[PDB]
């Protein structure tokens, strides 16, 4: 009622006052004396040319050589990036796929989309073929992300304002995260796989706690829907890519916004965000048909990856940082180095 | 310079490529239609002759169709509406008799404006179905159409009232040259609905064929 609304207003005012008090100097002032990385030159080393429709997601394997990509033709393809060979080709039940995942052990892959089901596939079977291990159902909205906690735990992000943690062996949600007021479109596991963040359509990102399930912090500052999120390699920060042509860097400990990656030239949103191995560079996949390598410490464009004829929808960096793979809406992938 | 195992892996990859090419060639011959409406507009009725998305598969005149019904996807429409960019046509179904109150004709107009004047569906021809024709005739025999259209000047006759409603619905689109809207008075318990859909699909197919040769 009125008193509860007043209490919420005063609590948010106190939160804003505390955030303003804890802010003493933006990192731009601290970083002015560091040497810029300069121009970044990237060349298309390989071009995976197997798909036949729009590509919506891809995930690097833990060995930094195998990767799995999902496209609208109802096919899951596992690539050998070194030789551009097709290790596997998994025909999905529903061609409307908006996410993909690769297990850290490499035994399983995950798929999901408009079918509201996050299926799991068994790569290493005695029969020699890939079968579906378990279909996870219970989301009332479309699937937008899915990450493998381990061989037995998977956490998914749905379009019904809910994030859930599953259990492949049993098939039911262990925990349910309900803090958002809009569609959730992204997910990013912490380096220690103890926390994670989600990017929702209400222009806010919440940091959860998978062990018990509750929103630790809520980060705001965006002006439109958040389309992609990614943890900093240190695990104490993350970056968000939204539809207002901006990328922003938040810090978990300080609970504030650090920098914004914006320019007057670009006006389209950001569809994918990923860091580098050392966290110095930020890669964002715009709708301008090319990616920008933002210098994450100085917010200056260090280079452009312009080799795609359509909107870049997925973008990832290997564990060792040796390559970055971008998949756009033309049925093409490109390995840059 | 490849070893024996590398050569065998390359052969397996080539076989996979052949299978993928065959699958894509077979899939490119299937007509994909997106079904839209206001929930109670009558999508279940039109889909009857042949927990997220629901796909309906049927064949007419040796042509393989595929109708997708979003149905209960109660989420952000603009967040997943671009997945359907590239369908042969859009079947927007609305009820002619649904104009009483709780009014919903304005909601259908808003939905049609949102779908037709969309950046993704710039060139995708939209097929408009106006069902519940008998119920609309019964309603118009007693209740005048002025309860829905304040700026209406006509008699309470089914023909001119239906023509006026169709004209108002058709005048919603902006791009009147790169996109065509097809109007059909369905609810006739015949095969006319699927024949009309087939004719529109054939026109779209001819338009697409007139693009690969540069004749466009």
């Amino acid at each position, epitope marked *: 009622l009125d008193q509860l609304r007043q209490e919420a207003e005063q609590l948010k005012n106190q939160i804003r006052d505390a955030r303003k008090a804890c802010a003493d100097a933006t990192l731009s002032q601290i970083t002015n004396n560091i040497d810029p990385v300069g121009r970044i030159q990237m060349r298309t080393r390989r071009t995976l040319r197997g798909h036949l429709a729009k590509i919506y997601a891809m995930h690097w394997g833990t060995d930094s050589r195998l990767l799995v990509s999902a496209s609208q033709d109802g096919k899951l393809i596992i690539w050998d990036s070194y030789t551009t060979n097709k290790v596997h080709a998994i025909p999905l039940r529903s061609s409307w796929v908006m996410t993909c995942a690769y297990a850290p052990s490499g035994n399983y892959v995950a798929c999901g989309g408009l079918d509201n089901i996050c299926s799991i596939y068994n790569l290493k079977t*005695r*029969e020699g*073929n890939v079968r579906v291990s378990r279909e996870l159902a219970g989301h009332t909205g479309y699937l937008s992300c899915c990450r493998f906690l381990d061989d037995n735990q998977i956490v998914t992000s749905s379009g019904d304002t809910t994030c859930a943690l599953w259990d492949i062996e049993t098939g039911q949600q262990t925990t349910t995260f309900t803090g958002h007021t809009g569609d959730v479109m992204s997910l990013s596991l912490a380096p220690d796989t103890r926390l994670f963040v989600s990017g929702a359509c209400d222009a806010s990102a919440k940091l959860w706690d998978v062990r018990e399930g509750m929103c630790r912090q809520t980060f705001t500052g965006h002006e439109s829907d958040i389309n992609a999120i990614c943890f900093f390699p240190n695990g104490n920060a993350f970056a968000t890519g939204s539809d207002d042509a901006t990328c922003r860097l938040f810090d978990l400990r300080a609970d504030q916004e650090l920098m914004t990656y914006s320019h007057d030239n670009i006006i389209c949103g950001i569809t994918s965000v990923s860091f580098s191995k050392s966290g110095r560079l930020l890669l964002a996949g715009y709708d301008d048909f090319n990616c920008n390598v933002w210098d994450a410490l100085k917010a200056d464009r260090a280079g452009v990856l312009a080799g795609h004829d359509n909107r870049v929808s997925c973008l990832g960096v290997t564990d060792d940082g040796m390559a970055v793979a971008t998949g756009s809406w033309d049925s093409f992938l490109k390995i840059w180095n | 310079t490849l*070893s*024996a*195992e590398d050569k*065998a*892996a390359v052969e*397996r990859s080539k076989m996979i490529d052949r299978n993928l090419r065959e699958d894509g060639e077979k899939a490119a011959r299937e007509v994909k239609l997106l079904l839209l409406g206001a929930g109670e507009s009558g999508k279940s009725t039109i889909v009857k002759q042949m927990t997220g998305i629901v796909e309906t598969h049927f064949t007419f005149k040796d042509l393989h169709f595929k109708m997708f019904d979003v149905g209960a996807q109660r989420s952000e429409r603009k967040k997943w509406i671009h997945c359907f960019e590239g369908v042969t046509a859009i079947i927007f179904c609305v009820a002619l008799s649904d104009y009483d109150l709780v009014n919903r004709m304005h909601e259908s107009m808003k939905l049609f404006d949102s779908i037709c004047n969309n950046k993704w569906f710039t060139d995708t021809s939209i097929i408009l179905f106006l069902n519940k024709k008998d119920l609309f005739e019964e309603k118009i025999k007693k209740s005048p159409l002025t309860i829905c259209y304040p700026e209406y000047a006509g008699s309470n006759t089914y023909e001119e009232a239906a023509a006026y409603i169709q004209c108002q619905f058709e005048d919603l689109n902006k791009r009147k040259d790169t996109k065509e809207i097809y109007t059909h008075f369905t609810c006739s318990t015949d095969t006319k609905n699927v024949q009309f859909v087939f004719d529109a699909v054939t026109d779209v197919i001819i338009k697409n064929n007139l693009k690969d040769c540069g004749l466009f």
Partner: single-chain antibody
Amino acid sequence: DVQLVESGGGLVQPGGSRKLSCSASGFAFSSFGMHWVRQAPEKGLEWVAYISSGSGTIYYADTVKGRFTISRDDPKNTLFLQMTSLRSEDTAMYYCVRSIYYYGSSPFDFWGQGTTLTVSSSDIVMTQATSSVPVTPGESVSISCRSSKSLLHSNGNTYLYWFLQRPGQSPQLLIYRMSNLASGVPDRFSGSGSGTAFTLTISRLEAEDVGVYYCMQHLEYPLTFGAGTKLEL
């Protein structure tokens, strides 16, 4: 489960044209390459033929080229091998080994039961040095295998496979590509080495480990096995 059963052996007069067959059931036969490996009674294994997935590549041993034919029937899930002009050297026990090739796969993983046939009266040389060695439970025995050409390819993986033939049953795969441990093999077995120097160690062995151990190369055809190191006691 996976099952490879062969039939067609028996007694053949010299100059016959008898055909062998092998029926497979329990796995996706259409995506596996099939080999034939014979074993003369008081001898070791010897590669015979090979046919890939889709029958696109077929290799033959130099001894049987021109007299043997290998073919598959994928819808029937059966593998054939037709022999013509049999000679007294062709007396052996024939196996139906299977192998699937991709990145990280384990070829020669399952071996058939084996059928016996009796007829009435630049290759890499793989030498296994010692032919017999007595062992006791609780010890650690290392088997040494050697090759002429270096088995380290430019990719970085050495193609050497370890097999174990228990008394009275088919051989089984232990280690593929000289370092990886096969599926179902306990941690006890371990292997390492380098080019032209390969060793397999059995730390803290026990019973049901007796039998001859064979080492095989896969760098280039024809595949060659070792003499076989026998373990007794």
